[PDB]
Enzyme design. Structure first.
Site, short mmCIF file in Angstrom:
data_model
loop_
_atom_site.label_atom_id
_atom_site.label_comp_id
_atom_site.label_asym_id
_atom_site.label_seq_id
_atom_site.Cartn_x
_atom_site.Cartn_y
_atom_site.Cartn_z
N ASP A 35 0.80 -1.21 0.00
CA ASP A 35 0.00 0.00 0.00
C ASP A 35 0.83 1.26 0.00
OD1 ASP A 35 -2.00 1.92 0.44
OD2 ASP A 35 -2.43 1.29 2.50
N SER A 199 -1.53 15.68 -11.82
CA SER A 199 -1.83 15.26 -13.18
C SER A 199 -2.12 16.51 -13.98
CB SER A 199 -3.03 14.33 -13.22
OG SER A 199 -3.39 14.03 -14.56
#
Ligand SMILES: NCCN1CCOCC1
EC number: 3.4.23.22
Length: 330
Positions: A35, A199
């Site tokens: 994770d 992004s």
């Protein structure tokens, strides 16, 4: 040194990925959920409340000649999905695909919430976010990657998750045969302890790319792709019959649909998530309504580039002095 291990989806929907990890002497192999959104290495164990263990493999520190109780240390964690676990701490030898860390903090669960108990295939989590998030008290502990870093040939790990197929986590090296084109690196903020990046935008199917800054975290421990409501609405508007269902808790769509792809930007580069990666099957057994793999982050407080996005790419988690993230098509 380097390490290389295969990661396998736990079910037919890629709901999560498990990677075998060797703990203790003699080795006790547990299948952990790697994770990058958390920083605790915790396991189901001989100390976990009996009624909270349902099919998981347990770590028994009393059978490991290298396990040492970390005196007075406890841990307690709550995840964004509402799940939680807590317990005590041992130091022990931990190996991932040939790479060994001696004295790694192995957080032994005494309690786990129902969400962990019901996943018989997940024996615990191996945190790969920044050690600043580690919950061990009173002395915070380092992640497996943090402990191995100095020893690695290159201070990096890579995530190459498969779609309905096994993938690989590599430590200390970049496998140049695992991706196409080049890896585009992008800046990371470690202020919240995550692999947080920006992004450059998105496209829905064959649509025109929209240049827009989307701050989010690269999180292998989150199954779906969580993005701003405006972005998620633009995606599902291309699917006939798709709608946001308050009863289900997200966007659902007719199981008979063929989904459009979703493109996200990494600098000038583009990662394309094929449409089939966004189908998470029937909302309940036998229903013809399917759950969407792209959901709104509005209730979260942060955008999450979970497995739906990451599995479309070869992802480099660069732990150099100034950490960065690298993405390549594959
Ligand atoms: N137990 C509910 C959560 N889990 C998460 C991982 O995949 C299967 C479902």
């Amino acid at each position: 040194s380097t390490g290389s291990a295969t990661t396998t989806p736990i079910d037919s929907l890629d709901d999560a990925y498990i990677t075998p990890v060797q703990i203790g002497t003699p080795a006790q192999t547990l299948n952990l959920d790697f994770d990058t959104g958390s920083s605790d290495l915790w396991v189901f164990s001989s100390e976990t409340t009996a009624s909270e263990v349902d099919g998981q493999t347990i770590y028994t520190p009393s059978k490991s000649t290298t396990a040492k109780l970390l005196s007075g240390a406890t841990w307690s964690i709550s995840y964004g999905d509402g799940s939680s676990s807590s317990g005590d701490v041992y130091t022990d030898t931990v190996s991932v695909g040939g790479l060994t860390v001696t004295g790694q903090a192995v957080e032994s669960a005494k309690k786990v919430s129902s969400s962990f108990t019901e996943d018989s295939t997940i024996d615990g989590l191996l945190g790969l976010a920044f050690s600043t998030l580690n919950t061990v008290s009173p002395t915070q502990q380092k992640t497996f990657f943090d402990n191995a870093k100095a020893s690695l040939d290159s201070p990096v790990f890579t995530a190459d998750l498969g779609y309905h197929a096994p993938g690989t986590y590599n430590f200390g090296f970049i496998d140049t045969t695992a991706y196409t084109g080049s890896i585009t690196y992008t800046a990371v903020s470690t202020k919240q302890g995550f692999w947080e990046w920006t992004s450059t935008g998105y496209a829905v199917g064959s649509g025109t790319f929209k240049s827009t800054s989307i701050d989010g975290i690269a999180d292998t421990g989150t199954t779906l792709l969580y993005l701003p409501a405006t972005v998620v609405s633009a995606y599902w508007a291309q699917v006939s019959g798709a709608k946001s269902s308050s009863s289900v808790g997200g966007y659902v769509f007719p199981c008979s649909a063929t989904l459009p792809s979703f493109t996200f930007g990494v600098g000038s580069a583009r990662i394309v998530i094929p449409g089939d990666y966004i189908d998470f099957g029937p909302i309940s057994t036998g229903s013809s309504s399917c759950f969407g793999g792209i959901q709104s982050s509005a209730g979260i407080g942060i955008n999450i580039f979970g497995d739906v996005a990451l599995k479309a790419a070869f992802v480099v988690f660069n732990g150099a002095t100034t950490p960065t993230l690298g993405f390549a098509s594959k």
